[PDB]
């Protein structure tokens, strides 16, 4: 649903993230793979160690998809339809995992943006990531 305030908030905070978006993604993936070992089950082909260039390259991929969502926030289904097919319809990704990733993303953002991660932005950002997750699991329903 994402009210007009949330959109503004998500746009602002993503703005600050700017060119670090890819470094931010790679970090979020790292916090997830460590904190939540059960997610590593989907990435048995990766080297998931601290400096893995596969985690880096994948972090940028996650960051760009999110940047695409922000830029197309009033049309996310259309924007991400293809990544839905993939995630929901081909890799068959357990939905619970999208919460764990969104959580790690929020931790990464809190760790880097101490001025912009207010209560309100945190709330917006949580809603935004909940929507992106809904679209990604959309096949499932």
């Amino acid at each position: 649903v994402l009210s007009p305030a949330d959109k503004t908030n998500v746009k602002a905070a993503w703005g600050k993230v700017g060119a670090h978006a890819g470094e931010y993604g790679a970090e979020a993936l790292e916090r997830m793979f460590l904190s939540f070992p059960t997610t590593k089950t989907y990435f048995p082909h990766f080297d998931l160690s601290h400096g893995s260039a596969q985690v880096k390259g994948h972090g940028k991929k996650v960051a760009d998809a999110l940047t695409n969502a922000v830029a197309h926030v009033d049309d996310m289904p259309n924007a991400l339809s293809a990544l839905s097919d993939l995630h929901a319809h081909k890799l068959r990704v357990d939905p619970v995992n999208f919460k764990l990733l969104s959580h790690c993303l929020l931790v990464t953002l809190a760790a880097h943006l101490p001025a912009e991660f207010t209560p309100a932005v945190h709330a917006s950002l949580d809603k935004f990531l909940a929507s992106v997750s809904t679209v990604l699991t959309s096949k499932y329903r």
Binding site: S35, V107, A111, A120, H122
Partner: protein, 146 residues
């Protein structure tokens, strides 16, 4: 929860640094703001219609302190979270009827708050260690359901 020498090291150096007067109110405030359903339990706290309302509410910062203290206890007694939390579990389960999922959410907003406070210090290894703990406290609080 188990926790290795180095995980404990990581959890214990950081916790010593924690402002136990403020963090505890930030977590609760943010829980209410981000997951508004939980406000049902705190309608006596008063003016909570906006985030600035909530964050300045003296009873919020007052109660968040009680919460932080219970976390310090679990930290004290990781080997016996269950015995440590029984009186709280009975309260939260039998009396209040809180769905255990909300224990998880408070745990996780607590982890954000520490990330927000400590920044790069809150590296991924130190996160992974705090997720264990947080999960052990949630599991313990919910015991009376089990």
């Amino acid at each position: 929860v188990h926790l290795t020498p180095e995980e404990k090291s990581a959890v214990t150096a950081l916790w010593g640094k924690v402002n136990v007067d403020e963090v505890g109110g930030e977590a609760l405030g943010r829980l209410l703001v981000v997951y508004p359903w939980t406000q049902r339990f705190f309608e006596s706290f008063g003016d909570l219609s906006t985030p600035d309302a909530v964050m300045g509410n003296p009873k919020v910062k007052a109660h968040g302190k009680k919460v932080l203290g219970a976390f310090s206890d679990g930290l004290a007694h990781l080997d016996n979270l269950k015995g440590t939390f029984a009186t709280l579990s009975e309260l939260h389960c039998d009396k209040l009827h809180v769905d255990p999922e909300n224990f998880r959410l408070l745990g996780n907003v607590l982890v954000c708050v520490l990330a927000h406070h400590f920044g790069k210090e809150f590296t991924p290894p130190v996160q992974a260690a705090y997720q264990k703990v947080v999960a052990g406290v949630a599991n313990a609080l919910a015991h009376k359901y089990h």
